[PDB]
Ligand binder design. Structure first.
Ligand code: CLA
Ligand code: CLA
Ligand code: CLA
Ligand code: CLA
Ligand code: CLA
Ligand code: CLA
Ligand code: CLA
Ligand code: CLA
Ligand code: CLA
Ligand SMILES: CCCCCCCCCCCCCCCC(=O)OC[C@H](COP(=O)(O)OC[C@@H](O)CO)OC(=O)CCCCCCCCCCCCCCC
Lengths: 160, 215, 41, 57, 742
């Protein structure tokens, strides 16, 4: 009599369904606390965090699998590539925003809360906010790469 | 109101030797066609029984007699041994073994075929086609008992409702011969030797004898 | 059986026809093999 | 192997003994039970063999 | 309820309906007006549930049809045994199996074909067979052509009985619907009766005919001298001198205390160093366990004595929080729909054929089968295709069930439900996995090709550079090596020689089997397998789940199971049908199986098969180039295809020139398929309009108005020739290669 699997928000005529991986308290808590979902925070602020995390992470694959190392002294220079990819990406984001949102326009996110609490206007998703988000994404992206690289110079890690 | 073992609806007790036993429900008449019809089986047990009733005797009579009777080279070999080629290797005969069978199938072909006609038609056999005995044919209303006269020259309880008290006798003995012969098939098969001869070993001493013993 | 004759003359008519043709062709070849020309004129 | 035979008999007995404690024709089979004996017999044989082989090691 | 035999009396028998084409369908029994009529007649010939709606009649049709099928198989077996008696060198092969090529078909000397009767050895001219029948017959202890001839008659007699039964059970005594539905009964019998007694029966012929005769053959005694099988049954002395356990009768079995029977039954395992086949002493023992197991298994289901299981009971009691009341109602569905049953059975029988192939190559069952590479490559490849096809057929009937038999209002399931209620989640994910697998299997190859071509071998995915060692399969491989004595003390040698490690078996100068290495090359191909399989699954599962409805077509179920489309609207809706998903899935099964059998052929020649001399020196056929050149697409094109195709393109004038002919012949019909696959009936019908004009001109226009093939048929024709062409090419390529080189 107890099923775990339920229609979304109690509405069976809408797309999604409710499952442990979608509406668990752990999943809900985790996703609500990512920088992306902090609706009430500065978009620029939210971005930098995403950049930092992402940047930092990208150095690994480039350096270890790069043509330049692989026993070739080039080493940590790869990280530099990663610094190049965050530039490409930034470009894409800037483009996505420019094209999507217009200057005058307002947000396109959804104002109703899941519970119907109409009380909430939200987000970046505006020409102004998105620019901020990408702009912060970049700064964070470059800084992420640099600090990972910085660690590379100091060394000590088992993989490289 | 009669002794009975196992469960089924149509075993009325209207058939001779009915102990109401059909755990497999072979005689259930729900779906009938082919050789699964109930009446056919009734006829069959009797035929199989009559033949078996007769055969069991053949199986041992030659065996027994050469033992305390006047039979020489024709000394009964195992019942199994004359007919099947490998063990006894058979015995020569006035006629070739394969040929007899042809003749044998030929003779049977006539009697057996007609009997079937009795089953497919009441008096068809007894009707037409020249020769005496045709009158002999068609006899009875029931194929199982053609009511020979001919088949029954002597009324022999045919008239008395006591004929029932014969039917069962015929039926019970029949199952008995049947059972018996099946025994031989095994006895002779593991025992070798003759069913009767086989009997003696159990007889000479019994503790020593039997299947467990046999092994 | 009229009807059996009727089953026949269906596409079984094709196979009976082609089997006859194949046979004829085969025998001809068995009789006159490797012919690249008509040499009787 | 008399010990073996006794073991097999014990298993068979335990299985037939279940003609009460365990499954047989049970609630309402249209039979006057033969079926139960066989299965109990067969189950007993199987158990006996399993124990015996183990005894053999 | 009580289970019993239920039948009905005669239901007609006449040639009247033979004279009336398309009688089974009310639409098509009126005769032809166009040439479409003819094609429809053959395409709806076996669609029984399309003929009538009565379940009893459909069930009776498929029952006699199975008799018809068996009749053919028995007639087919009758010929193989007959040809092994009149037109074969089996008695010659029986003395020198390691050098004489097995052959069982002689060709008539017409038109020049006699060249195909090549030197197969034994002073015999004919076509080398790869069926494997010689190794079966030798394993059964078959000595003379007389015995093969007797089996030929026996099979033919059985063929007559099967055919007679079909007539008898459709025209004379037709089983009732209640009879077919007794599934608890049928499973009990097929478990115990067919499989249990069947395996028990063969365990007997082995321990009385096979095991005794095979020992003589291995001792080296002349086959003609070996006593007939019946001399072993009669005089137990012969079967006592060898396998002395027969001294006693039923003891020890009857007195238990098992066993002194370890003499002719054992858990030895591995491979016979003299025959190259699995120990017959193990196989006989194997069938002993299988018999009893299936005999035990044949008493699970309740029938007429209250003891057992109601399958309906079992299913309903299997419901969880995640699944609802699921499993409830499955019994009524599976006892009411033939297509539902056929889908499961095809999926499983097809899957079985695939594991058979992988088991018969790595554990060679018949004597002198392993070193006959011509047969082993054929047997493995044959079963891969048979299994491959049957699996695609499961998808077709799963789809047909969804369209035809699925009814929520009458036979709801809840398990089938929910699945339909998130079919987009399943297909979208299966979509993703395929893309991930494509990149991470095939993309690695393209990486390797580009790096090699740029002269960067160290930047490749290889054993000598960036290694992708399949450690999980390797660890298992090692585990089966250390299995005997440690894990399974009863096992003397390993399960397979591919797990042996330091053990090799040779017969003649050829290698039977050895430990098969696994490296980066094996890693890449397996993910290619994982990739191709999923995509096939995607196409077929998408077809089944979206067979009834779709956001594009809300009422697709009304259009049927086999329809061309729903017009050019909504952007175009060609091949939305479930049939067209089976059609698309067919190509991908072909794609997957083809790279599987290429994986086999190269790996065996390169790392397994080859010549071995009495110094230990092993020389493989392609010389171990799999590891360094199968990791590149150019390598497959060059070192595999280009190199090995030389035999079939250099076979003219030889005994193998028929393969040369079928090689080109199959390339032809393959390309031929592309005409149908790349075009549409709109063009062809208009072309036929101009041609019909010409016939009318000369008063030779037919009443049966010629029409272009239907949209669906055009696809049916196309995929059929694509398959025939592609598969037959590899066939000719494989056989020529392995017969010439092997
Ligand atoms: C061919 C031999 C034969 C045939 C045709 C029959 C037929 C019949 N018997 Mg009989 N029976 C037989 C031999 C036979 N019996 C023997 C040898 C015995 C002594 C053990 C009995 C003891 C017996 C009893 C107590 C009863 C019957 C009854 C019946 C009737 C109902 C059961 C039935 O229809 O199943 C049809 C049977 C077959 C189609 C034969 C199938 C046998 C297969 C091949 C198994 C063989 C196994 C064996 C180990 C080898 C039916 C007319 C019942 C009845 O009402 O009497 C009229 C009754 O209750 N029989
Ligand atoms: C022409 C072809 C032909 C065929 C195939 C048959 C076949 C048969 N006849 Mg017939 N018969 C025929 C012509 C034929 N007959 C003619 C022209 C006449 C003259 C009227 C007869 C008069 C006749 C009589 C009186 C009988 C038969 C009987 C039989 C059956 C018994 C055969 C037997 O068991 O022993 C096999 C024969 C071997 C040589 C062995 C068998 C079905 C008998 C029967 O119906 O069952 C007993 C029967 O009594 N036939
Ligand atoms: C069963 C095996 C078999 C055997 C032993 C034969 C044997 C023969 N066939 Mg037949 N044939 C067969 C099967 C067989 N055929 C089949 C299955 C078919 C297709 C149905 C044919 C169709 C066939 C045709 C059309 C001819 C033969 C002819 C011949 C004869 C050659 C005559 C000659 O002198 O040459 C030389 C003839 C010259 C004119 C020079 C020869 C006796 C020939 C024959 O004798 O005509 C009746 C003939 O032309 N056969
Ligand atoms: C095939 C069916 C079958 C049937 C109906 C029986 C029936 C019987 N067996 Mg047997 N047995 C069988 C198969 C069968 N057995 C097989 C296949 C084997 C090989 C292991 C044995 C080995 C065996 C042994 C060692 C013994 C029996 C014994 C017995 C008897 C006593 C059973 C028991 O222990 O419980 C009460 C009983 C008559 C016991 C006996 O001898 O009976 C007194 C005995 O100890 N059986
Ligand atoms: C335990 C006895 C038994 C055996 C051995 C079989 C065997 C078979 N069944 Mg049957 N079945 C049984 C009981 C049995 N069935 C019962 C009780 C039911 C009712 C529920 C059914 C209902 C059923 C259906 C609906 C179908 C089958 C089919 C089949 C065939 C499957 C294909 C195959 O393996 O080819 C192998 C061939 C052989 C092994 C030759 C065996 C020929 C006979 C049975 C030998 C018996 C001789 C015996 C010693 C006396 C196979 C012959 C399928 C079929 O193919 O129909 C023709 C099919 O559709 N069965
Ligand atoms: C496939 C089923 C099958 C069939 C029909 C048979 C049939 C037979 N067996 Mg075999 N047997 C089988 C399976 C089978 N067996 C299996 C699977 C094993 C291994 C456990 C044996 C082990 C075996 C032995 C040791 C002997 C037989 C013997 C016999 C014969 C009995 C003679 C006798 O009474 O003993 C007395 C008989 C032909 C006996 C024999 O060979 O005849 C003299 C015999 O000594 N069987
Ligand atoms: C257990 C096996 C099995 C059975 C009993 C069925 C039964 C059925 N199928 Mg299924 N099917 C199967 C396996 C099976 N199929 C497999 C393995 C596949 C994957 C390919 C399919 C894919 C499939 C599709 C797509 C369809 C069916 C359909 C049908 C139904 C009607 C088919 C018909 O009329 O026959 C007609 C038979 C022919 C027209 C013969 C055509 C010849 C083939 C195409 C080529 C043969 C070439 C040969 C192998 C070698 C070349 C020789 C040549 C040179 C002479 C019928 C219920 C149809 C349906 O609608 O279901 C209700 C349907 O559309 N099946
Ligand atoms: C060789 C020709 C070919 C190729 C490459 C493909 C490829 C694919 N098929 Mg198709 N298919 C083909 C023939 C082909 N098919 C034919 C003839 C048929 C008729 C039966 C089909 C029928 C078919 C169906 C029904 C389906 C597919 C699906 C797929 C996709 C599977 C998922 C995947 O692997 O993602 C990975 C992509 C690849 C492995 C392609 C190669 C990628 C390269 C190596 C790397 C990228 C290069 C470079 C970095 C890009 C930048 C270059 C820049 C200059 C632009 C994949 C894109 C399935 C699908 O849609 O996916 C879920 C699907 O359901 N196919
Ligand atoms: C998890 C992987 C794995 C697998 C697939 C197997 C598989 C097997 N084991 Mg092994 N086993 C394992 C782990 C495994 N085992 C581990 C971790 C240990 C402890 C180190 C053992 C100790 C072990 C022993 C002692 C035996 C097996 C035996 C067997 C074989 C028969 C098992 C059986 O039930 O038959 C049925 C067994 C009976 C009906 C009798 C019950 C008594 C059993 C054998 C104890 C089978 C091949 C048996 C064997 O050697 O086969 C030849 C055996 O004697 N295993
Ligand atoms: C090796 C190949 C498999 C690779 C693993 C990843 C593939 C996963 C594909 C399916 C995942 C979706 C699972 C949800 C489907 C789902 O909810 O199933 C339902 C099931 C819960 O069981 P229930 O309580 O419903 O059981 C009662 C009834 O289902 C049985 O009568 O959960 C699982 O199956 C856990 C195992 C998942 C792992 C399967 C492997």
């Amino acid at each position: 009599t107890y099923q775990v699997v339920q229609p979304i928000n109690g509405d069976p005529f809408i797309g999604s369904l409710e499952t442990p991986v979608t509406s668990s308290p752990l999943v809900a808590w985790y996703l609500s606390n990512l920088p992306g979902y902090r609706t009430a925070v500065n978009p620029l602020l939210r971005g930098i965090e995403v950049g930092l995390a992402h940047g930092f992470f990208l150095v690994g694959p480039f350096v270890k699998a790069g043509p330049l190392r692989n026993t070739e002294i080039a080493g940590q220079a790869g990280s530099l590539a990663a610094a190049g990819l965050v530039v490409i990406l930034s470009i894409c984001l800037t483009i996505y925003g420019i094209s999507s949102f217009n200057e005058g326009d307002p947000s396109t996110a959804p104002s109703l809360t899941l519970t119907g609490r109409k009380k909430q206007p939200d987000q970046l998703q505006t020409a102004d906010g998105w620019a901020k988000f990408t702009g912060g994404f970049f700064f964070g992206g470059i800084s992420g790469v640099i600090w990972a690289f910085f660690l590379l110079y100091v060394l000590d890690l088992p993989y490289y | 109101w009669f002794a009975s073992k196992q469960s089924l609806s149509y075993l009325d007790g209207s058939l001779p030797g009915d102990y109401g036993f059909d755990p497999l429900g072979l005689s259930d008449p729900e779906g009938t066609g082919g050789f699964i019809e109930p009446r056919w089986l009734a006829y069959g047990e009797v035929i199989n029984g009559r033949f078996a009733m007769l055969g069991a005797v053949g199986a041992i009579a030659p065996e027994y007699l050469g033992k305390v009777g006047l039979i020489p080279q024709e000394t009964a070999l195992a019942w199994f041994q004359t007919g099947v080629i490998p063990p006894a290797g058979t015995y020569n005969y006035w006629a070739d073994n394969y040929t007899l069978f042809v003749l044998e199938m030929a003779l049977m072909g006539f009697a057996e075929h007609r009997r079937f006609q009795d089953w497919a038609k009441p008096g068809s056999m007894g009707k037409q086609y020249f020769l005496g005995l045709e009158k002999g044919f068609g006899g009875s209303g029931n194929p199982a008992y053609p009511g020979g006269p001919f088949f029954n020259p002597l009324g022999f309880g045919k008239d008395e409702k006591s004929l029932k008290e014969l039917k069962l006798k015929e039926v019970k003995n029949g199952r008995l011969a049947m059972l018996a012969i099946l025994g031989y098939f095994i006895q002779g098969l593991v025992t070798g030797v003759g069913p009767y001869q086989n009997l003696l070993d159990h007889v000479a001493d019994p503790v020593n004898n039997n299947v467990l013993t046999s092994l | 059986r009229d009807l059996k004759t009727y089953l026949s003359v269906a596409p079984v008519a094709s196979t009976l026809w082609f089997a006859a043709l194949a046979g004829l062709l085969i025998e001809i070849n068995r009789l006159f093999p490797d012919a690249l020309t008509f040499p009787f004129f | 192997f008399i010990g073996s035979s006794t073991n097999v008999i014990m298993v068979a007995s335990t299985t037939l003994m279940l003609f009460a404690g365990r499954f047989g024709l049970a609630p309402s089979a249209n039979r006057k039970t033969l079926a139960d004996t066989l299965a109990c017999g067969t189950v007993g044989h199987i158990i006996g063999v399993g124990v015996v082989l183990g005894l053999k090691t | 309820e009580v289970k019993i035999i239920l039948d009905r009396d005669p239901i007609k028998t006449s040639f009247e309906q033979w004279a009336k084409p398309g009688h089974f369908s009310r639409t098509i029994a009126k005769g032809p007006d166009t040439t479409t009529w003819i094609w429809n007649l053959h395409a709806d010939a076996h669609d029984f549930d399309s003929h009538t709606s009565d379940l009893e009649e459909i069930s009776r049709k498929v029952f006699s049809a199975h008799f018809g099928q068996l009749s053919i198989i028995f007639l087919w077996l009758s010929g193989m045994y007959f040809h092994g008696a009149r037109f074969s060198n089996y008695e010659a092969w029986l003395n020198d199996p390691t050098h004489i090529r097995p052959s069982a078909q002689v060709v008539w000397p017409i038109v020049g074909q006699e060249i195909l009767n090549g030197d197969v050895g034994g002073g015999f001219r004919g076509i080398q067979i790869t069926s494997g029948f010689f190794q079966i017959w030798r394993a059964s202890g078959i000595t003379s052509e007389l015995q093969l001839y007797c089996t030929a008659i026996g099979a033919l007699v059985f063929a007559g009985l099967m055919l007679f039964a079909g007539w008898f059970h459709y025209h004379k005594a037709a089983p009732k619907l209640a009879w077919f539905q007794d599934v608890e009964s049928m499973l009990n019998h097929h478990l115990a009766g067919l499989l249990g007694l069947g395996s028990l029966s063969w365990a007997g012929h082995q321990v009385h005919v096979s095991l005794p005769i095979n020992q003589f053959l291995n001792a080296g005694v002349d086959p003609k001298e070996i006593p007939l099988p019946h001399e072993f049954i009669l005089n137990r002395d012969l079967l006592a001198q060898l396998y002395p356990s027969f001294a006693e009768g039923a003891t020890p079995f009857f007195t238990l205390n098992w066993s002194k029977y370890a003499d002719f039954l054992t858990f030895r395992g591995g491979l016979d160093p003299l025959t190259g086949g699995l120990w017959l002493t193990d196989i006989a023992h194997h069938h002993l366990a299988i018999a009893i197991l299936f005999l035990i298994a044949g008493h699970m289901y309740r029938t007429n004595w209250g003891i057992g299981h109601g399958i309906k009971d079992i299913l309903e009691a299997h419901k969880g929080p995640f699944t609802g009341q699921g499993h409830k109602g499955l019994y009524e569905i599976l006892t009411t729909s033939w297509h539902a049953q056929l889908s499961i059975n095809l999926a499983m029988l097809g899957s079985l054929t695939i594991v058979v192939a992988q088991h018969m190559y790595s554990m060679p069952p018949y004597p002198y089968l392993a070193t006959d590479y011509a047969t082993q490559l054929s047997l493995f490849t044959h079963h891969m295709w048979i299994g491959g096809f049957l699996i695609v057929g499961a998808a077709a009937h799963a789809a047909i069930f969804m369209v035809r038999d699925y009814d929520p209002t009458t036979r709801y399931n809840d398990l089938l439900d929910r699945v339909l209620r998130h079919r987009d989640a399943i297909i979208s994910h299966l979509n993703w996995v395929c893309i991930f697998l494509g990149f991470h299997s095939f993309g690695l190859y393209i990486h390797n090709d580009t790096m090699s071509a740029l002269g960067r071998p160290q930047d490749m995915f290889s054993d000598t550079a960036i290694q992708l060692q399949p450690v999980f399969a390797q660890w298992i491989q090692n585990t089966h090596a250390l299995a005997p004595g440690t894990t399974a003390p009863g096992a003397t040698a390993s399960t397979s020689l591919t797990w042996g490690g330091g053990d090799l078996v040779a017969v003649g100068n050829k290698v039977a089997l050895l430990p098969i290495p696994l490296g980066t090359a094996d890693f890449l191909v397996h993910h290619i397998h994982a990739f191709t399989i999923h995509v096939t699954v995607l196409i077929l599962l998408k077809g089944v789940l979206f067979a009834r409805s779709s956001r594009l077509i809300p009422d697709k179920a009304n259009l049927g199971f086999r329809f061309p489309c729903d017009g050019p609207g909504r952007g175009g809706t060609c091949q939305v049908s479930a049939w067209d998903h089976v059609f698309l899935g067919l190509f991908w099964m072909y794609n997957s199986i083809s790279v599987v059998i290429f994986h086999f052929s190269w790996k065996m020649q390169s790392d397994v098969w080859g010549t071995i001399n009495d110094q230990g020196v092993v020389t493989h056929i392609t010389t171990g180039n799999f590891a360094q050149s199968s990791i590149t697409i150019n390598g497959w094109l060059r070192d595999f295809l280009w190199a090995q195709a030389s035999q079939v393109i250099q076979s003219y004038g030889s005994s193998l020139s028929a393969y040369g002919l079928f090689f080109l012949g199959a390339h032809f019909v393959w390309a031929f398929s592309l005409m149908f696959l790349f075009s549409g009936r709109g063009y062809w019908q208009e072309l036929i309009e101009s041609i019909v004009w010409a016939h009318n001109k000369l008063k030779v226009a037919p009443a049966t108005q010629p029409r272009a093939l239907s949209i669906v048929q055009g696809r049916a024709v196309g995929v059929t020739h694509y398959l025939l062409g592609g598969i037959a090419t590899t066939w000719a390529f494989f056989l020529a290669r392995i017969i010439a080189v092997g």
